Design a protein around this ligand. Structure first.
Ligand SMILES: CCCCCCCCCCCCCCCCCC(=O)OC[C@H](COP(=O)([O-])OCC(O)COP(=O)([O-])OC[C@@H](COC(=O)CCCCCCCCCCCCCCCCC)OC(=O)CCCCCCCCCCCCCCCCC)OC(=O)CCCCCCCCCCCCCCCCC
Ligand SMILES: CCCCCCCCCCCCCCCCCC(=O)OC[C@H](COP(=O)([O-])OCC[N+](C)(C)C)OC(=O)CCCCCCCCCCCCCCCCC
Ligand SMILES: CCCCCCCCCCCCCCCCCC(=O)OC[C@H](COP(=O)(O)OCCN)OC(=O)CCCCCCCCCCCCCCCCC
Ligand SMILES: CCCCCCCCCCCCCCCCCC(=O)OC[C@H](COP(=O)(O)OCCN)OC(=O)CCCCCCCCCCCCCCCCC
Ligand SMILES: CCCCCCCCCCCCCCCCCC(=O)OC[C@H](COP(=O)(O)OCCN)OC(=O)CCCCCCCCCCCCCCCCC
Ligand SMILES: CCCCCCCCCCCCCCCCCC(=O)OC[C@H](COP(=O)(O)OCCN)OC(=O)CCCCCCCCCCCCCCCCC
Lengths: 155, 177, 87, 99, 606, 128
């Protein structure tokens, strides 16, 4: 590998843009770099930001798990759009409708758990009644003191 | 879209691919076989109703709203064959697809366990390394200037010669090693 | 488990599916019976035949390979290539 | 339409070579040419000798040290007899019989 | 004493012996799976003796045998707690694992790495019994992370497949999110109580136990796949069917439930923790059972089934019934392992077909699998006096008759109806009707490994609830007085679920085509939760992992401020010093200005 | 009638629903045939080395080397300090440092003030 096949600075003159497009093995009409706001991209192409799962899975790929050919310019976040990771494939339900349905369902369920905590169910019974001063010594109460008498009656 | 030899998709190819995808997603919707068979004939009638449309702009528009019809009426979990991509057995055996060149890395005491196999392998290796320069000079005398337009490879235009770039298609591993 | 496929077996199963298809008479049919030129079948009929092949042998043929299978012998040979028969 | 005759001839030749390869993947009957190479032994080697070892370890190295094996004291009922002492636990009060 | 502790440790050392056998190998084994299966059969038989003599007296003990590490006041010893929880869960796990491995001797028979598979599966069993026999939080953390890592290695078994590696890393991710709360709990108990041992935790008995119990609930949410940390258990069906059958039905997935059951003296005095557990378990058992209604992969349906039953276990912890929850663990193990084994028999018989829309007509072609699948579904839904009756029905009898979050109760009963719905969905699309699988029938189930392995869990699913629930001692007081509409709640709601789903099943034979609604797409796309969160939360991390952290900070700005600005400063000062024109006139004029600034401006002569 | 699919960042528009797929013009056939030609030339240059019996090693991809050199070494020589980079480097650089400083300082001042008044239950806390 040599220097003028490595990525360089941001192309401004159209012959420099065409030389960059020849370097990354793509058409000048399809070569778009990241916009020069000074984030450190240079002449690197802004590939369209799609995942690798979206590719044709029956195509004879050079790298089958990557779904990526030889010499094809890799995406800047190619390690992010591997099929082990972020997939941007289209979904049957819309993204915003999915977010609204999930948010509304979770918020409604948490609301109704708070409602049921405010208004709990119970049984029509008295409290459970325990002997020996509501079990004073069994709950670790000290014997050198003396509690109040808890008295239960028959009914 | 993205094809190895074709540069695009014709209207006929788009219609056939939409027809197959509509039948597959319909079979996902219509689980039972008689019921799918009934609705598959109804969908075939819907595809046959606009088959004789010589106006290409009208036909492309009908294809477009039929794709909208499909994207509305698709199953959220369509049926996928197990070894098909997205299937439950897809690329399962790729960890068992050891490439053939690793057989060159074996110790001789484990190459001598299969003497007929490696004696039969060395003539494949010899055949490939004599075929290589003939198929290179076949490729450079048939490829146009500017490089190859398509990814289509030629066959062997003589007798005795092997097709160019044949080794990794022939010596690919089995699907069930 | 998993009995192996033979070219005789794949041929018998492909022609067996085509004999169960009402737009093909079983006596005109052979392994070279071209669908559009001999059997006179539609392209939609060819897509349905390849889908019947998929439902028969249990695997998916891609469409770029499906649209080139225009005779039973090419279908049998594609299933031979994708199942690696006659080892 | 389908294939072109170039594609037909190439895929036929690749099919022939692929079938020859898959045939040459087979095994000779002499292959693999190998180099020249008690009924309840499982209950003895995996059970009885480990019970011996672990009982030796627990009896003469674990219980010889304090608080290494701490057992819950046994549940005592009215009417029991203590083995160490012989003290009979007295029974309960007579029940206010309910049914 | 000398018999109990001996066979207790002989069970564990007996399990570790085939690991030494596979690590000290030179030859190709004469059926190492038969060796490991015989080992686990004998370990089950060995563990039944301390179980019998715990049924006899109630004999619990602790073997703190090996002093490992004293961090100044924390004495970490190798300590084994043989109580009711160990004495019941160890033989159930060994029995289930013995059935799973006799299944695995058939299901994984073509695998050339079958000895590695049985090695990994035995290592999972060893780490799980390290988890459930642990007496301090460190050894329980060893077993915890051990079953997490063996879950990783057994999900990603076919490691060339991208989705298996993805689901395994997903399962690790959700488990480590639970491990945040587990290590929070260990931190709280060490700092406030100077212990990780269970005995000092239970004897000190803190009242400010909000934070450690929140940590333990987060740990159980990670491990048992409760809501928020649920989707890895459906994703974990990518591994082989014995992996989804042992680890992901019965044994590993109850470890969070078992962790909260183990800390029952702390949850019995924290009503806020009981409320959080009740709400989270009811949310999970509603959501996963609702998602199960529209799935078509059979292993996904049974995975949502077992996560719904784990949510029911979290419910019955949350109503202060930890022993009923542990009884439901020991009950649920048998029939849920059997349901996964029957589904794997169907999958192997249909040439690795897992979708129920390519099934049907399997009532008569697979008679033993059909019989055991129907027995498993009836045990799951709570047919009377099968094994799932002897815990789950009682759970409802304590869920109704308690001071309960009423919305949690109503969603628990809706989930109870949903269990019957997905059970008859399995029976309808798999066993009933006419075939949908392809034309080369290789349906066969005549292996004695398969028959005996489903047969022993079949005897378990018929009798084990009765046997265990009549062998356990009473640990609470069972509520046995309630009105007749309340005693008949679970059975009537289950029967109504069956009837409504019979209507659902018979509307599938109709010759009408319907468009999918938003309830259907909400249930079929997993509550939209793996679609959003597995696209969004990686994105906002990984861009931030590259654009912010890698590129902007540690390739540019932290590189800009210290070395680059100083380097450019030294370059510029070097060029200002050395830009002299070699003219003697200018050097002596500089010397004159030096002398003048020295005298008049700096006063270096005064 | 039908809800139009709205593409998002993490859910793109399908190929079947995009209007620019249905361009039947000449210049799109030009661009697609030229992309096919570039891709076929790259494929040929790959598999003339991939199928070579004499080659034993790594087919070096200039795309991969170029990708790693862009991701690592070309970042600083094409950095320009300006308004956006300064605001993002001070927003994501020292913002969290200030945030965690004030959170942990507030928590420890509250804790120390509770401890030296005898309020925080530090009864069995003898490991630290
Ligand atoms: C000194 C203070 C800075 C003044 C000099 C700046 C550089 C020279 C200059 O002016 O060049 C223009 C000019 C031509 O240069 P140029 O073409 O602009 O080249 C730069 C490029 O344009 C490149 O573009 P640019 O101009 O945008 O970027 C230049 C870059 C500006 O950087 C950036 O644009 C990006 C970075 C942001 C700004 C820097 C932030 C640094 C933050 C501090 C470091 C981390 C601290 C962490 C603390 C944590 C706890 C609080 O500045 C530097 O590289 C210089 C850094 C500071 C110089 C002194 C460093 C001494 C270090 C000694 C060891 C300690 O050079 C001259 O005219 C040479 C003579 C300079 C005139 C005199 C300047 C004032 C002197 C006052 C007295 C100082 C006495 C010593 C004080 C310190 C020691 C006690
Ligand atoms: C096949 C080999 C087996 C042995 C064959 C030959 C012997 C035949 C049978 C006789 C048994 C051997 C003689 C008796 C055994 C030794 C007795 C003895 O006193 O030994 C001294 C001691 C007993 O403990 P100790 O308390 O006396 O000494 C510890 C040392 N101090 C006090 C300084 C801290 O050591 C051992 O016995 C070591 C055995 C360890 C077994 C378990 C290992 C587990 C490994 C996990 C590592 C990480 C754990 C982290 C978590 C821990 C918990 C939080
Ligand atoms: C009692 C309280 C209960 C509270 C419950 C809720 C608490 C947690 C809240 C939500 C946080 C967890 C969920 C979000 C992250 C999930 C990440 C994940 O699992 O991604 C899976 C994804 C692939 O998934 P999928 O597309 O389904 O794969 C099949 C086909 N490829 O895989 C990938 O895309 C690969 C991703 C690799 C890099 C991961 C980047 C994200 C890391 C997130 C860290 C979160 C830390 C949280 C800390 C919490 C502290 C309390
Ligand atoms: C427990 C007692 C179960 C037996 C008594 C109740 C039977 C019952 O509910 O029958 C109703 C129904 C069968 O009838 P149905 O499907 O409505 O009409 C077609 C003609 N069989 O539906 C059923 O029988 C299916 C539900 C049976 C549930 C049994 C397990 C609980
Ligand atoms: C924490 C400390 C932070 C600062 C560490 C020191 C500066 C960074 C490391 C040393 C310089 C790194 C370097 O190579 O900088 C490149 C630049 C040009 O160097 P050049 O001689 O052209 O390189 C050979 C030809 N390629 O080099 C230069 O422009 C010269 C850099 C000289 C550095 C001198 C450091 C002096 C420190 C005390 C200052 C008072
Ligand atoms: C402020 C501001 O606007 O800075 C921009 C300035 C360059 O000016 P420009 O925007 O190009 O006109 O850029 C500069 O003046 C250089 C950078 C200003 C100081 C940035 C300090 C924080 C940088 C990150 C530190 C991380 C630790």
């Amino acid at each position: 590998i040599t220097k003028d096949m490595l990525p360089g600075p941001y192309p401004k003159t159209p012959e420099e843009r065409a030389a960059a497009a020849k370097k990354y093995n793509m058409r000048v009409e399809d070569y778009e770099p990241y916009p020069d706001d000074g984030m450190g991209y240079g002449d690197y192409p802004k590939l369209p930001d799609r995942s690798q799962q979206e590719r044709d899975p029956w195509y004879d790929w050079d790298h089958p798990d990557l779904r990526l050919n030889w010499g094809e310019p890799m995406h800047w976040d190619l390690d992010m759009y591997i099929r082990n990771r972020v997939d941007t494939s289209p979904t049957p339900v819309n993204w915003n409708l999915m977010c609204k349905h999930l948010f509304g369902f979770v918020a409604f369920m948490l609301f109704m758990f708070w409602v049921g905590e405010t208004y709990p169910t119970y049984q029509p019974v008295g409290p459970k009644q325990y002997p020996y001063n509501n079990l004073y010594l069994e709950r670790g109460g000290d014997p050198n003191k003396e509690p109040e008498p808890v008295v239960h009656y028959e009914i | 879209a993205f094809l190895p030899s074709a540069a695009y998709l014709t209207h006929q190819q788009k219609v056939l691919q939409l027809y197959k995808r509509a039948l597959r997603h319909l079979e996902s919707r219509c689980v039972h076989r008689d019921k799918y068979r009934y609705f598959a004939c109804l969908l075939r009638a819907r595809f046959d109703e606009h088959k004789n449309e010589k106006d290409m702009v009208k036909a492309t528009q009908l294809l477009r709203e039929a794709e909208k019809e499909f994207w509305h009426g698709q199953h959220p979990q369509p049926y996928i064959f197990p070894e098909s991509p997205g299937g439950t057995s897809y690329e399962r055996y790729e960890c068992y697809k050891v490439p053939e060149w690793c057989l060159d890395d074996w110790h001789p005491s484990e190459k001598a366990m299969y003497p007929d196999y490696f004696a039969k392998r060395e003539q494949w290796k010899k055949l490939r390394r004599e075929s290589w320069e003939r198929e290179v000079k076949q490729l450079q005398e048939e490829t146009p200037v500017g490089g190859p337009r398509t990814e289509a490879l030629p066959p062997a235009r003589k007798q005795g010669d092997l097709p160019p770039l044949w080794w990794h298609i022939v010596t690919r591993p089995r699907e069930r090693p | 488990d998993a009995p192996p496929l033979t070219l005789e077996g794949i041929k018998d199963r492909v022609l067996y599916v085509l004999k169960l298809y009402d737009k093909i008479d079983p006596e005109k049919l052979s392994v070279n019976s071209h669908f559009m030129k001999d059997l006179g079948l539609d392209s939609l009929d060819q897509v349905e035949i390849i889908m019947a092949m998929e439902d028969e042998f249990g695997f998916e043929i891609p469409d770029i390979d499906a649209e080139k299978l225009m005779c039973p012998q090419e279908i049998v040979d594609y299933i031979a290539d994708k199942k690696d028969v006659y080892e | 339409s389908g294939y072109t005759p170039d594609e037909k001839l190439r895929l036929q030749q690749l099919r022939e070579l692929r079938r020859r390869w898959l045939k040459d993947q087979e095994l000779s009957p002499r292959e693999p040419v190998l180099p020249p190479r008690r009924h309840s032994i499982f209950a003895f080697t995996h059970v009885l000798i480990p019970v011996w070892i672990i009982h030796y370890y627990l009896k003469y190295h674990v219980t010889t040290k304090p608080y290494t094996i701490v057992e819950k004291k046994p549940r005592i009922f009215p009417g029991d007899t203590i083995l160490e002492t012989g003290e009979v636990i007295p029974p309960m009060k007579e029940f206010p019989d309910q049914h | 004493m000398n018999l109990f502790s001996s066979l207790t440790l002989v069970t564990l050392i007996l399990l570790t012996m085939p690991i030494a056998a596979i690590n000290f190998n030179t030859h190709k084994f004469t059926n190492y799976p038969l060796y490991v299966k015989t080992t686990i059969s004998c370990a089950f038989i060995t563990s039944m003796i301390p179980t019998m003599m715990f049924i006899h007296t109630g004999q619990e003990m602790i073997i703190s045998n090996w002093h490992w590490l004293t961090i100044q006041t924390l004495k970490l010893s190798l300590s084994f707690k043989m109580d009711f929880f160990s004495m019941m869960f160890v033989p159930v796990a060994l029995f289930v694992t013995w059935s799973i491995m006799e299944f695995s001797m058939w299901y994984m028979h073509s695998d050339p790495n079958i000895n590695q598979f049985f090695k990994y599966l035995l290592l999972f069993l060893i780490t799980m019994l390290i988890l459930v026999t642990a007496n301090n939080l460190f050894q329980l953390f060893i077993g915890w992370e051990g079953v997490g890592i063996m879950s990783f290695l057994l999900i990603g078994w076919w490691y060339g497949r991208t989705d298996a590696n993805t689901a395994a890393l997903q399962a690790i991710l959700y488990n480590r999110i639970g491990d945040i709360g587990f290590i929070l709990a260990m931190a709280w108990f060490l700092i406030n109580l100077n212990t990780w041992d269970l005995q000092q935790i239970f004897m000190l008995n803190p009242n400010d136990s909000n934070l450690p119990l929140m940590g333990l609930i987060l740990a159980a949410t990670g491990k048992s796949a409760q809501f928020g940390l649920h989707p890895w258990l459906p994703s974990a069906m990518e591994g082989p069917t014995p992996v989804s059958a042992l680890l992901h039905s019965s044994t590993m997935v109850v470890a969070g439930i078992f962790l909260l059951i183990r800390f029952y003296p702390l949850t019995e005095n924290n009503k806020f923790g009981q409320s959080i557990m009740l709400c989270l378990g009811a949310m999970t058992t509603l959501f996963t059972a609702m998602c199960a209604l529209t799935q078509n992969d059979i292993k996904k349906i049974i995975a949502f089934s077992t996560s719904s039953q784990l949510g029911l276990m979290m419910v019955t912890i949350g109503i202060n019934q930890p022993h009923l929850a542990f009884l439901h663990i020991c009950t649920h193990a048998f029939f849920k392992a059997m349901l996964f084994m029957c589904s794997g028999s169907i999958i192997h018989s249909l040439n690795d077909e897992q979708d129920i829309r390519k099934m049907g007509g399997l009532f008569k072609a697979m008679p033993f699998t059909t019989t055991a699948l129907i027995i498993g579904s009836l045990a799951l839904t709570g047919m009377p006096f099968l094994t799932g009756f002897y815990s789950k029905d009682l759970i409802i009898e304590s869920a109704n008759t308690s001071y309960t979050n009423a919305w949690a109760l109503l969603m628990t009963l809706v989930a109870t109806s949903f269990t019957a719905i997905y059970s008859t969905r399995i029976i309808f699309f798999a066993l009933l009707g006419q075939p949908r699988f392809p034309t080369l029938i290789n349906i066969n189930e005549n292996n004695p490994f398969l028959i005996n392995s489903i047969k022993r869990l079949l005897i378990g699913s018929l009798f084990a609830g009765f046997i265990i629930s009549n062998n356990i001692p009473p640990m609470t007081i069972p509520q046995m007085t309630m009105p007749h509409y309340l005693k008949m709640t679970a059975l009537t709601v289950t029967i109504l679920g069956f009837i409504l789903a019979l209507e659902i099943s018979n509307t599938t034979h109709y010759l009408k085509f319907n468009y999918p609604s938003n309830t259907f797409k909400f249930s079929n796309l997993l509550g939209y939760y793996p679609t959003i969160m597995h696209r969004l939360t990686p994105y906002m991390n990984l861009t931030m992992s590259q654009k912010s952290a890698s590129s902007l900070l540690d390739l540019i700005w932290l590189e800009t401020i210290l070395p680059k600005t100083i380097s450019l400063a030294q370059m510029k000062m070097s060029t200002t010093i050395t830009s002299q024109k070699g003219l003697i006139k200018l050097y002596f004029l500089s010397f004159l200005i030096t002398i003048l600034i020295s005298t008049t401006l700096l006063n270096f002569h005064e | 009638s039908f809800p139009k699919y709205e593409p998002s960042r993490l859910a793109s528009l399908p190929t079947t629903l995009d209007p620019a797929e249905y361009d039947i013009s000449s210049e799109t056939r030009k661009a697609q045939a030229e992309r096919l030609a570039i891709r076929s030339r790259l494929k040929r240059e790959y598999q003339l080395q991939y199928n070579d019996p004499s080659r034993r090693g790594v087919v070096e991809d200039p795309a991969l080397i170029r990708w790693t050199c862009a991701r690592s070494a070309n970042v600083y020589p094409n950095f320009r300090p300006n308004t956006k980079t300064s605001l993002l480097g001070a927003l994501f650089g020292i913002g969290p440092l200030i945030f965690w400083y004030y959170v942990f300082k507030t928590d420890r001042d509250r804790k120390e003030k509770l401890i030296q008044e005898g309020k925080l239950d530090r009864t069995f806390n003898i490991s630290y």
